[model samples]
Target: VDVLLGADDGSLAFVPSEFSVPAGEKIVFKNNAGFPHNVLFDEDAVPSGVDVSKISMSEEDLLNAKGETFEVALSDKGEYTFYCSPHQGAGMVGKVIVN
Candidate 1:
């Protein structure tokens, strides 16, 4: 299922701290706040069967603040931890728990 993420005072946090989605579903990480933010996952944090890190620019699901409607998709089943690179150290961290 798709999800809505937000940023409060540079702290990257999602509306709901947790959620669940089926395999192969799109995890649309849309930003509602009017500031710049990003949704990125580490290689180990991604689902068990999905390898999102190696996807080329044309195939990558990674989206920056440039695309308002940009999104990410999970093809595997597992938990994932992601953060806004810029604000991560500042407390801009979120998690994606899939099963």
Candidate 2:
């Protein structure tokens, strides 16, 4: 599955807003209309059994180029909350529920 970032209207959000997938699947976040985007899951927002550090990416990188992508595989069965580090303040966030 894929979550798109922002839009041509300059709005910041995860396209579709939410998603669901089976455990062990990879979720791809793409920089669609947004110039710079990235996915950073909240360490404290994951499920109890989830080791967030294992699924997070380095904050130093940004998905600035068009079509740039960031992907993460969810091995645990639980819900996840991630935000675009740069635009999170503007409500650029999303959810992924694993089954």
Candidate 3:
């Protein structure tokens, strides 16, 4: 699965908003909007035993898109919620359903 960090409409959100994939599968997050953004899982937003921090982007890399991409493997089976570290308060959030 693939997701865009931002949209063309200037909205601070992940394209598709939600998606699903099998356990142990990888989801690609593309910086399509070329704006500052990053992926950060809420401390209590993922299933027990799931470690979303493994896929988080660094602060320095979050300031520009530069066509960069990040791949996150969903190793656990459950619903996972995430947000952009600097834009979460602006409503930049999304979800992934792992099965």
My TM-score estimates for the predictions, one after another, are 0.67, 0.89, 0.89
lDDT of 3 at 35: 86
Global lDDT scores for all candidate models: 0.58, 0.81, 0.81
Candidate 2 TM-score, true structure as reference: 0.89
Q: Per-residue lDDT tens digits of candidate 1, residues 61-94?
A: 3345523654666666678777665555766666
Of 1 and 3, the candidate ahead on lDDT is 3
lDDT per residue as tens, model 3, 13-98: 89979888899887888887848888877768899987666767764557475467888887888999988888988888998898
- The root-mean-square deviation over C-alpha atoms between each candidate and the true structure, in angstroms, is 4.1, 1.4, 1.6
Candidate 2 overall lDDT versus native: 0.81
How many collisions per candidate? Answer: 1, 0, 0
Angstrom error of the Cα, residue 73, model 3: value is 0.5
User: Residues 1-99, candidate 2, lDDT per residue (tens digit)?
Assistant: 877887767688788788889998878887887667778889878888877666766677788776787788888888889888888788998888989
